[PDB]
Amino acid sequence: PLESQYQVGPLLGSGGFGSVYSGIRVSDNLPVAIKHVEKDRISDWGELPNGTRVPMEVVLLKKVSSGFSGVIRLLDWFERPDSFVLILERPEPVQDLFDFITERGALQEELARSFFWQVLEAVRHCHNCGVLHRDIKDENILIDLNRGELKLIDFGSGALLKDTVYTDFDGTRVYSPPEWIRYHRYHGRSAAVWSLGILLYDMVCGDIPFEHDEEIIRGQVFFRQRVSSECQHLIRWCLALRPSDRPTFEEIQNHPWMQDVLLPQETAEIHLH
Ligand SMILES: CCN(CC)CCCCCN1c2ccccc2Oc2ccc(Cl)cc21
Question: Which of 44, 135, 144, 245 is catalytic?
Answer without folding.
Answer: 135
